[PDB]
Amino acid sequence: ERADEKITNININQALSILKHLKSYRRISPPVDLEYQYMLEHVITLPSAAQTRLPFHLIFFGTAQNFWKILSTELSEESFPTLLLISKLMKFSLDTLYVSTAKHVFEKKLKP
Numbered sequence: 001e002r003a004d005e006k007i008t009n010i011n012i013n014q015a016l017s018i019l020k021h022l023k024s025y026r027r028i029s030p031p032v033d034l035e036y037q038y039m040l041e042h043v044i045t046l047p048s049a050a051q052t053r054l055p056f057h058l059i060f061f062g063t064a065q066n067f068w069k070i071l072s073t074e075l076s077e078e079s080f081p082t083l084l085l086i087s088k089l090m091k092f093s094l095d096t097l098y099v100s101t102a103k104h105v106f107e108k109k110l111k112p
Contacts, residue, residue: 014062016088025082027053029073034058034066064092071097075104 001012033052038058039046054074058066067090071083080101087097 010061014089018060018086021052021082021086021089022056022059025052025053025079027074028076028079032070032073033036034069038066059086059090064090067092068096068100072100075101077105077109 005013019090031046035050035055035058036046054070058070067087074083083095084094087094
């Protein structure tokens with residue numbers, strides 16, 4: 001950003017809020033096989049931070065399919081506002097998140 005070169009296909013003006021939101025959020029689930037596969041394509045040992053946070057490479061410039069594969073296992077009532085705000089900043093389809101959250105809350109909280 002200091003270099004002032006927005007010619008790259010990767011955006012820079014929006015990732016600062018994403019990093020803060022990811023730092024403020026704590027992951028509750030073990031890493032999914034998608035993260036293992038993406039890390040083993042560019043082989044590097046997974047650090048311990050995979051147990052507490054979400055990978056930035058698969059979120060920012062990754063596909064929305066990866067987005068919904070990763071946030072599928074992270075759905076909860078407390079995580080719903082943070083993930084909804086992230087999806088607002090992702091400019092993705094909020095309706096899929098709403099349907100998935102409704103089904104998850106029905107199954108985990110309303111069913112018992």
